Structure formats: structure tokens, C-alpha cells
Amino acid sequence: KKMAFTLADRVTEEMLADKAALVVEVVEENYHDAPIVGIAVVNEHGRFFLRPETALADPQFVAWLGDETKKKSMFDSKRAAVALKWKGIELCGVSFDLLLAAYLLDPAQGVDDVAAAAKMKQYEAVRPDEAVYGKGAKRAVPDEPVLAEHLVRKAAAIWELERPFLDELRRNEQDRLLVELEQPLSSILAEMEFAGVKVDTKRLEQMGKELAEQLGTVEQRIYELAGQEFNINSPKQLGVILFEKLQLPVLKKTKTGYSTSADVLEKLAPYHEIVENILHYRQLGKLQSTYIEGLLKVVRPDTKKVHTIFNQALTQTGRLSSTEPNLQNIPIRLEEGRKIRQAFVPSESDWLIFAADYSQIELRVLAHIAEDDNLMEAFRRDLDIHTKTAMDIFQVSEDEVTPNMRRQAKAVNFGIVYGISDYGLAQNLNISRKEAAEFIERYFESFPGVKRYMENIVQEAKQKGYVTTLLHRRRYLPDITSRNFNVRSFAERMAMNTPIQGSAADIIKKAMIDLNARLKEERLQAHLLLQVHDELILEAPKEEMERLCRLVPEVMEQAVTLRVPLKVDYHYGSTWYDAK
DNA sequence: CATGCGAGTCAGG
DNA sequence: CCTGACTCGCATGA
Ligand SMILES: OC[C@@H]1O[C@](CO)(O[C@H]2O[C@H](CO)[C@@H](O)[C@H](O)[C@H]2O)[C@@H](O)[C@@H]1O
Numbered sequence A: 001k002k003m004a005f006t007l008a009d010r011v012t013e014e015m016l017a018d019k020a021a022l023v024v025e026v027v028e029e030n031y032h033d034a035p036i037v038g039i040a041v042v043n044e045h046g047r048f049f050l051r052p053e054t055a056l057a058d059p060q061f062v063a064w065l066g067d068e069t070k071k072k073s074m075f076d077s078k079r080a081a082v083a084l085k086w087k088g089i090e091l092c093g094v095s096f097d098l099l100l101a102a103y104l105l106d107p108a109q110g111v112d113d114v115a116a117a118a119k120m121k122q123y124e125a126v127r128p129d130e131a132v133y134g135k136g137a138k139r140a141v142p143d144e145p146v147l148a149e150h151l152v153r154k155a156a157a158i159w160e161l162e163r164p165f166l167d168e169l170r171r172n173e174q175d176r177l178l179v180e181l182e183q184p185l186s187s188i189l190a191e192m193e194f195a196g197v198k199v200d201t202k203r204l205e206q207m208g209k210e211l212a213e214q215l216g217t218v219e220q221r222i223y224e225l226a227g228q229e230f231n232i233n234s235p236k237q238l239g240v241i242l243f244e245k246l247q248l249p250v251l252k253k254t255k256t257g258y259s260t261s262a263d264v265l266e267k268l269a270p271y272h273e274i275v276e277n278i279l280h281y282r283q284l285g286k287l288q289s290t291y292i293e294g295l296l297k298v299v300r301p302d303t304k305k306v307h308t309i310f311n312q313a314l315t316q317t318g319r320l321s322s323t324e325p326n327l328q329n330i331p332i333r334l335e336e337g338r339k340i341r342q343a344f345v346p347s348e349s350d351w352l353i354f355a356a357d358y359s360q361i362e363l364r365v366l367a368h369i370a371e372d373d374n375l376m377e378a379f380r381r382d383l384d385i386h387t388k389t390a391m392d393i394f395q396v397s398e399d400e401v402t403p404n405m406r407r408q409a410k411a412v413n414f415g416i417v418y419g420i421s422d423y424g425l426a427q428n429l430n431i432s433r434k435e436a437a438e439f440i441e442r443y444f445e446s447f448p449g450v451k452r453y454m455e456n457i458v459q460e461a462k463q464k465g466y467v468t469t470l471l472h473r474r475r476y477l478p479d480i481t482s483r484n485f486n487v488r489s490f491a492e493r494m495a496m497n498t499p500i501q502g503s504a505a506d507i508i509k510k511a512m513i514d515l516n517a518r519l520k521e522e523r524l525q526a527h528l529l530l531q532v533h534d535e536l537i538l539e540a541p542k543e544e545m546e547r548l549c550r551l552v553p554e555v556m557e558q559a560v561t562l563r564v565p566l567k568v569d570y571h572y573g574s575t576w577y578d579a580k
Numbered sequence B: 001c002a003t004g005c006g007a008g009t010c011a012g013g
Numbered sequence C: 001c002c003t004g005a006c007t008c009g010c011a012t013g014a
């Protein structure tokens, strides 16, 4: 049965009630400077559909949109807020976001549209967006009649589902997480995405030029060493050259054939000169295709900025993700790749990039949650945690710790967080299970509180069916009861890791909210540009750097109070590369 | 041919 | 281990 609604030709007062479900539809995946194809409003007076050209030109409607006292319930309000920012219109008063509500209730559900969130509460009187708009090449906005009914049905679903969702969040003790953390954060991410990051395209194009030269040279050397030309970028073709023509040993296989991953190649290097060259080719090729060409493809030519989109409702841990471009994985480990950061510059003359990052926030969080006396004391002394871990597991003094000892202790720490097992650490340390197991055993002997936490959290996940973070985010782990060792083991590692990675995500999100309020109170022009899991990147006038050096670290360090101090390091410079 | 996606790979925290 | 993007190449549609 069709849903009744008014297809309005003009805005009326009853459409501007102080409480309503609102839909501002942006069909394009990337909503930056994208079209708004329709608007739907559902409130106590009825259901309405408005053409965007009409609504967005109406002074009363625009005022209503920007009035914080007029409350709106939506799905993915960031999408609408950003689409509206590009049109110079402010969206305020969003008191409920169904996408974020659904995400907090169960990140694993993968809610990507109103229909999916609605199905969680047995509401199915709304179609999935994909069914209405089609996919990819066939994607298209349907005729007004079909479009209007769909938007009205989505607004109707939001109108009906708000209460049930808030009720469950309340029962889960997640009501404040939604209202005081995720929703306010959504507005901050919208501002960051809209601001964008300026790119020195001339710089990137030059790096690409010289990179192309080097690739050409290495490519030729590889053909020479192989005795023939082939597609180096083809694992299948490369596998034939290495394991058949050159007879290199096969130490690892993939589900489909020979493995040619960097890990395997490093072990084969001593057998043939072609290996080192392939690894070098892989490094430069990655930079060229992904960080030079790929980046240049998404830079807006009129502003020379990239406008990422942060997915706030995707990860099972509470972390954000970044797309088009992904600004959370720009090279930094190797110097050649790190230079790519010289292309990310301040958006204004005489401005600088400021970057602040938490020092070992995940391990500090673990010290707090597990209440491990040894680990807490370590951070209270602000010790080098890897050297300290080495001292304890190997039973040696500080000056007796060798570089390799610290390297292995660091690997244990890198893993301990991710609940890593004997077979997981072994690969990273290129050792055996029995040995790796003894390392973990030694770690627990030194950090008994951590061992107790790992045992207790797994039992809790089994008992409750989920684990939680410091700010009450949750993750259900149904596989925790599986009778399949591998499946159960993974769930166990997730039970151990989620409260750690998840609580660290909670902390930085809270820091972002606190920071934005502080920047406004101080009327600084400085603003957030990016978040990379445990670090915040801002840009500001050079005349604000000294103030930011004291302000940003303090706000980040004071976001939450743990049993151990939080420590933040910071740097600033002319480019993101220099902010080191 | 065009479109699209699983596999393999590798970048970050 | 949490993510996203790029290549290649078998697969399939309009
Ligand atoms: O001593 C703890 C005791 O063992 C428990 C099993 O009986 O088991 C937990 O840990 C093992 C791995 O060590 C997993 O295989 C089980 O699934 C997990 O429940 C627990 O029930 C009890 O407290």
C-alpha cells in the first residue's frame, strides 16, 4: 500500500515544526559538491516531499535548517551537512542520527542505509537504496514519483525508529555515547572534510616524473636479470620467473599459486640479484600508482585540495576510516615514501601544519584497564616501553638490552595489543611457535595483571556475548563459543584487543570534541584537518603555533583521566613532511 | 569491448 | 590485527 504524502510545490509553515525526521538526499557516493536530488520531511503535521530547487531557495526553510532549536532526526547527517556546506547552507539541530545509532548498537550489522537499520527493529516498509537507485553503471535517480515515495518512506522510518533505537541505546548505557560523542564528532568531521587539505600538485608531479625515471631503470634491470620481459605487476607471471625460470625456493604458497609478497622475497634475496630489484620496484611502484597518480586524481583542480570522507560507522573497534583519498595511510616509514608528505601544505599563506600524537596510547590504556602494577609504573616513569619490556622478559639491566632484544620486545608489544598468538608473533619475528609461546609466557610472568585481564575479558565476552570500551562502545563476539579452534581463537583475540583499540578511539574522539570547543573559546583560526587514529593534524597561522604547542597537547592529555598519565608529542612545519 | 570484482599486494596505526 | 587503493585477469553482461 502506497504511503500518503504531500508533493509540495512550495514551503509551508507546518513543514517547519520544531521536531521532524528530515531527508536531504545525496545519491552520489562522494557527497562533496554533489547534487541534492530531493528533500522529505515528516513531522506531527504529516509527510512532505520538496524539490531542492524550491526548498533550498526558501528563506524560511533555510532558516529552519540552521535553527538549532528546531530538532531533526536523520540518517547519515554528515552527508547532508557537507552537501549543504558546499551550497553555503548550515544544517543545525540534528538531535538523532539513525546511522550512528545503528552503528553503536551493532557495528557488525554493517548498516549502510535506512532499510538496513530499520530491519533491526522488524520495520520493512522502506526499500534499500540500492534497489531504488541501482548500482554503478546502472546507478540513476528514478522519476520524481518513485524518488519522492522513497525519500518519504525513509523519513517515515526514521520518524518511527528514533524512539526504539534511543530506548535500546539507553539500556546499553550508550545514550551519552551517541548524544555527547558520536553526534558532536560528526559535525566536527563534516567541517574537516569540507575544509580539505591543500596539495602542492606541482611538487607531486615532479616527484612523479623522477619516480618514473627510476622505475624505468629498475624495470629494465629486472628484465635483464630475468633474461626476458614480463609483467612485474603480475604475481602469476612473476611467480613463473622466480620459481620456475630462476628456480628460487618456494617457501610460501597462496590460495591460488606462488606467494611473492615482500615477506617471502626478503628471504629469497640472497639467492638472486633480481629479488632486491623487484622489492625496489614494488616500493616505487606503490608510490607512483597509489600516492602520486592516485592522489592527483582526487585533487579538486579549482582549489587544489583533497576532501576525504571519514567513514564514522564502519569499523568494529570504533576507529574512523578515510576514503577518496585515504589520508590515514600516507607513507612515513621509509624516507623515499615519506617525501610524499612534502606535497601536503597549509591552505593559506603564512600558515603552518601542526601535528600532535599520543605516545603509546594503546599500551597506556591496557595498563589502565588491566591495572597491571608493573606496566602502570613503567608509564608513570615515562619509560621507553619497548626497552622496559625487553629488560623484564630477558631479565637484564637497561644497559644490557641489545638492539635485537628491544626489537623483539617491540614486536611483542605490537602484538600484545592485537591479542596476537604464538603463530602470529612467530611470523613477525621469523621464529617458531614453541619459542614465540615462551616469549608470551615470559611476558605474562612479567605482566601478570595483563595476563589476568586477557583471561578475564575472554570469559566476560563468553558470558555477556560482547566486550565494551571505556566509553561504552560494544562489539558482539558470537564466534567466541565456536567449536572451531581458529574461528574461536580469532574471536578471543578480538575480545582482548577491542577494549584496547576501542578505548583509544574513544579517547581521541573525545579529545577532538574538547579541542574544537577550546579553539572556539580562544577564537583561534587554527582548525582540524585530519585524524589518523592516535594523532591529530591541524593547520593554523604561524602566529598561533606557540599557543597551539601548549593548548593541543593539554587538551589531548586531559581528554580522560586514567590510572596512568597520557602523553602527547607534537611538531609543526611548512608541510606535513616537516611536522616532525 | 565495457563493466566489475576476487585475489594478491602493501600503505598506515 | 584494524583499514583502503591499486594491479592483474578470469568472468559476464547490455
Ligand atoms: O581456567 C579458565 C577456565 O578455562 C576457560 C575454559 O574452561 O576457557 C577459556 O579459555 C580457553 C583458552 O585458554 C578457550 O578455549 C575457552 O573457549 C575460553 O572460554 C573457562 O571456561 C574457565 O574460566
Ligand SMILES: OC[C@H]1O[C@@](CO)(O[C@H]2O[C@H](CO)[C@@H](O)[C@H](O)[C@H]2O)[C@H](O)[C@H]1O
Binding pocket: A029, A030, A031, A076, A099, A110, A111, A112, A113, A309, A310, A311, A312, A313, A314, A323
Ligand atoms: O558512515 C558512512 C555511511 O555511508 C555509507 C553508506 O553505504 O558509505 C557510502 O559513502 C562512502 C563515502 O563516499 C563510500 O566509501 C561507501 O562506498 C558508500 O556506500 C556506509 O555504509 C555508512 O556507514
Ligand SMILES: [Mg+2]
Binding pocket: A357, A358, A359, A360, A534
Ligand atoms: Mg604515536
